[PDB]
């Protein structure tokens, strides 16, 4: 249980009258508003800014916590991070070298269930790895701009229905009033609960991946021949206006 810690934090917050009035005057609806309150400003030229930022000493912001503190201040003369804190994260700012240090000498985390979480992406790779390629021919190709399914799905649903399913899988206590969907997809829900049981990956990341394999992406593309998603995902390699490439997916 983390319950008692939460309560102590809540009591802590209410000592600060500013935070107290916020929690009192702000409706649950209005959480969605104050969540997005910050000094930041939508960057109109990110490509420029990034090339500029990557030339500064400490362009990154760390999460405040113990894991951040495991990164040393410096490493063999290199300043990995600074004592000055980021306005947003309130944690130390750091160099891009800090990322490289972490990936070289940082703590070795647990990746159990990773392949089950990103099962969707690994199935792409498996379809490619096990595919066989036929001939490539040159000649005119008549392409028609059709709406087609870009990615194969576990089970296609409307966005709403999929969202409800994801609530039953990840956040059952907050799922609200039961739906017909909960019953129809009960076997899907059960199976995902099993697969995602041990993972320490953030629930929001899990929600994103569940969304990729439930919510269809149907877009207009110039296509010829098969329009099945296991072909469309490879469409860039299958054909042009002037050529054909035979492809047998795995």
């Amino acid at each position: 249980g983390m319950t008692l810690a939460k309560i102590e934090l809540l009591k802590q917050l209410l000592r600060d009258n500013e935070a107290k009035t916020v929690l009192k005057q702000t409706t649950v609806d209005q959480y969605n508003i104050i969540r997005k309150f910050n000094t930041s400003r939508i960057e109109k030229n990110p490509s420029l800014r990034m090339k500029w930022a990557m030339c500064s000493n400490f362009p990154l912001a760390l999460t405040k916590g113990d894991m951040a503190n495991r990164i040393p201040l410096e490493y063999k003369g290199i300043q990995l991070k600074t004592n000055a804190e980021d306005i947003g994260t309130k944690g130390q700012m750091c160099s891009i070298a800090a990322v490289t240090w972490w990936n070289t000498y940082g703590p070795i985390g647990d990746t159990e269930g990773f392949e089950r979480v990103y099962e969707s992406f690994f199935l792409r790779k498996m379809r490619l790895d096990n595919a066989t390629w036929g001939r490539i021919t040159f000649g005119p190709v008549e392409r028609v701009r059709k709406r087609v399914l870009l990615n194969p799905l576990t089970k296609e649903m409307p966005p709403d229905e999929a969202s409800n399913v994801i609530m039953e899988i990840l956040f059952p206590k907050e799922a609200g009033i039961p739906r017909e969907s909960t019953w129809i997809h009960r076997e899907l829900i059960k199976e995902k609960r099993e697969k995602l049981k041990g993972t320490m990956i953030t629930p929001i990341v899990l929600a994103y991946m569940l969304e990729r394999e439930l919510v269809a992406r149907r877009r207009f593309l110039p296509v010829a021949g098969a329009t099945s998603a296991e072909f469309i995902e490879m469409l860039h390699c299958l054909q042009g206006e002037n050529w054909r490439q035979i492809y047998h997916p795995g």
């Binding site: 649950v28 030229n45 490509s47 420029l48 090339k51 500029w52 030339c55 500064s56 000493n57 390629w133 001939r135 490539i136 021919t137 040159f138 000649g139 005119p140 059952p172 206590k173 907050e174 799922a175 609200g176 009033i177 039961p178 390699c237 042009g240 206006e241 002037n242 050529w243 490439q245 492809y247």
Partner: protein, 709 residues
Amino acid sequence: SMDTFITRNFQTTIIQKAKNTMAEFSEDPELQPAMLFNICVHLEVCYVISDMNFLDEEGKAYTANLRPQYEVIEGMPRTIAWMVQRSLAQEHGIETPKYLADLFDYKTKRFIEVGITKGLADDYFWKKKEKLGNSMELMIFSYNQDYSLSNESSLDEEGKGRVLSRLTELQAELSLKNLWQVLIGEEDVEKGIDFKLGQTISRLRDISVPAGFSNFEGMRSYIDNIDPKGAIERNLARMSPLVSVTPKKLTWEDLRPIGPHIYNHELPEVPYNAFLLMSDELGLANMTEGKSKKPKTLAKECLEKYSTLRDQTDPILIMKSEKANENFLWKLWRDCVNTISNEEMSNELQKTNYAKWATGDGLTYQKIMKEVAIDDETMCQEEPKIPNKCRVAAWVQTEMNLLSTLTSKRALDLPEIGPDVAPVEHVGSERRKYFVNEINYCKASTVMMKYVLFHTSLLNESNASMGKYKVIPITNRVVNEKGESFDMLYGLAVKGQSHLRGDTDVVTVVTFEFSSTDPRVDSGKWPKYTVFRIGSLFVSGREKSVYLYCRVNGTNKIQMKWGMEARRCLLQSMQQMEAIVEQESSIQGYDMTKACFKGDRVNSPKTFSIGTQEGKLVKGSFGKALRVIFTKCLMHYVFGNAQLEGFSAESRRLLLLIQALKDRKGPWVFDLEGMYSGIEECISNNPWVIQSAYWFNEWLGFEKEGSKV
């Protein structure tokens, strides 16, 4: 007057929760006192059943600890209620009821729905059985002591007593004040959306009407009621014929040359303004293993090889820019050479008097307050400088010729890609051996990489060393046809102060570049440069003089950024020509890459009209055409500004009109001189725009002649 009754009989907590509940169903407490009462009663009965009871540490019911027997789900917000209900269901390993319960019994592990009826309890009991089945226990009460509970109801006798007592007590009080009829007599009002306009907005709307209307009410009824048929036809009948689109059928003779002033010799010929030398460049080559190294170390080793040039302290001034100081510039050059030659790691230059001058130290105006400025009569709004008007310069054609030409060197730094598997990938790799090679060997490509790598390091220095003057070498890594690598040193540059906040903020960059070009041969090209003669080199058999082109220059974060991205010039050119290869491949049924470039057993090498030689068309190879487009795209970056943007966009209209003529599609025009006006105002002092205007006119001439045949 029930609202008074409700306030006196029910607690404040109960009434608030009941009002909140009505708000969630979007219903007005003040217009529906009956509903407010029923929800108050229902909520209280739930609390009556709960208030007294608790559980001890062994799970046995007693009466008064902090763990009540009942969880009161009714009375709180939906989202919290469902949170509570699902938390309970999940924790106790039971199904979640599809409707929202009123109570939960921790001892019974059962959800409970509570009902209050004026009629028979049995009737109300079985109207709930239809909907809840038996997901919940039922507790139905009535005002006259009647009641119906489910068989395994958790309600103890004493609680049942309090509920019925409280209900009858209320029944008495209501009928005593003649309020029972208000509860019985139907109460129902239709709920419309509430959006109404106050005074100000209504007044603003009244003065937002078109002429011919007194107020908004007038416009609304007018639009709702009248049939405007025939209005368009009527207005066109009285609209002046002077209002017309003035159509003119286009002919070749209507298309005069664009920008005739570029031929006017009374104007100065457009000078060289690029950030670095191009065809006039000269790289001091130094062979290496082929791997990377500190830029200072590279320059140091090149200058050690060419020590006679490095040690030259007594040069010959050949040409001098109008406002340049040749002493300061030379001193700065020596400072650069001496700094790069030394043993130290630092490439920082001292803020000397000659370096302060060259980098524009302290030249920004002082900000004073507006009050002082307003009272100062001498302070005015400057007239804006306009780009000068220039004529064609021969050097732009020369640059295009030389940059399009093949060399023995390759400078591209293209990294690895995973090995091919699909036939398409093999095809792509085989095609690249023609396309990429053709470009990699041409002069333009090496110049590109010089720009790319310099802007890369200049951007970094600009952020990392804002307060320091710094010497940055101008370099390349080059590979000959034998596979031997060389580090190239084209010169040294000095970065000034660079506190670049705004993306257009300028960092002054003083460039010192080597060249074999004598600036006196074509002096119109070099008014911006101060050139020294510093030595000689045995290029082949005979000597060539080595000059040092010195220039105070400048750039910003944006220009540096797009410089780092200039490699994409490859894609724009390669995409265009590969498209043609694919079209050709489609016709004959096989990969036509070799056939296009070099020719085939069954195919002549693809040729393109490439240029002119004393009046006549000259044909060129497929590869030449590729290199010309690549060079063209590189010039777009090097000479890119608003003048080029405007010229390209507006002239593209004439291009598409000329195509319509060539296709015999009978194009029409509505204001040709207006169209020309849009093009010609973009022709000022951009070397590439001016030259493009010249080329446009030349090309237009050939298309006119071809129309006859």
